[PDB]
Amino acid sequence: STVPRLHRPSLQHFREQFLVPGRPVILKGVADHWPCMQKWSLEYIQEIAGCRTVPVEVGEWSQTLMTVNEFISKYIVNEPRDVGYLAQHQLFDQIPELKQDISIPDYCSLGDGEEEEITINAWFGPQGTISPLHQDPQQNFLVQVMGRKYIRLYSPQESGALYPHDTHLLHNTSQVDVENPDLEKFPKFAKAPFLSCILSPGEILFIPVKYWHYVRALDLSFSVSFWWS
Ligand SMILES: [Mn+2]
Numbered sequence: 001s002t003v004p005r006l007h008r009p010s011l012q013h014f015r016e017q018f019l020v021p022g023r024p025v026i027l028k029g030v031a032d033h034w035p036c037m038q039k040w041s042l043e044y045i046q047e048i049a050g051c052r053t054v055p056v057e058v059g060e061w062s063q064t065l066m067t068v069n070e071f072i073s074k075y076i077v078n079e080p081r082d083v084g085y086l087a088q089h090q091l092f093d094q095i096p097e098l099k100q101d102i103s104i105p106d107y108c109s110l111g112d113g114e115e116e117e118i119t120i121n122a123w124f125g126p127q128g129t130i131s132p133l134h135q136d137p138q139q140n141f142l143v144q145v146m147g148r149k150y151i152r153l154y155s156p157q158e159s160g161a162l163y164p165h166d167t168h169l170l171h172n173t174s175q176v177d178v179e180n181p182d183l184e185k186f187p188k189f190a191k192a193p194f195l196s197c198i199l200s201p202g203e204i205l206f207i208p209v210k211y212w213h214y215v216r217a218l219d220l221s222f223s224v225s226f227w228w229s
Pocket of ligand 1: 134135136213
């Protein structure tokens with residue numbers, strides 16, 4: 001089934017129908033006019049951030065460091081040799097000027113945590129980046145700025161069909177490749193129900209705490225996530 005889209009729902013409707021029961025939703029009309037939505041071209045990113053060092057996940061997975069200018073040159077603009085992803089990086093703490101182009105969603109105030117503790121991560125990469133199926137320990141608003149992403153969501157109630165890795169370090173990550181699952185080794189995966197969507201610019205996906213999610217970029221993409229409680 002498809003994740004529902006709601007236009008600027010009230011705080012109470014979001015709380016009662018999505019936050020408390022832990023149900024995903026896409027919020028429309030919330031982030032669509034944030035400055036980032038019109039301002040964040042590649043050229044703007046290069047002007048404001050190009051000389052700064054960022055962590056880049058390549059691939060055989062490795063983590064390296066390079067400037068934003070290098071990342072753009074090697075993994076976005078020139079016919080790249082491998083997939084590189086500027087993933088899960090607190091770019092807005094590093095570059096406070098960019099924080100002026102985003103806002104904390106008002107719905108985060110329904111949480112029990114402090115705004116000071118909300119973690120804001122950038123996710124910037126070419127078409128074809130993949131975040132394998134995993135779950136996070138806080139609520140998440142994933143705001144799509146540039147490009148589209150295909151997202152698959154499985155409830156925590158389906159965890160037994162997703163074959164989490166046994167190591168404590170990877171217990172929040174599935175052993176299954178969502179889009180080409182090995183059903184001989186992971187047969188229960190096939191019948192596990194899920195939601196999916198294509199998340200487009202200006203839209204926010206609410207990923208409830210511990211909801212399993214898998215993400216593939218369909219175009220050159222930039223997302224901003226807000227981890228909150
Ligand atoms: Mn995640």
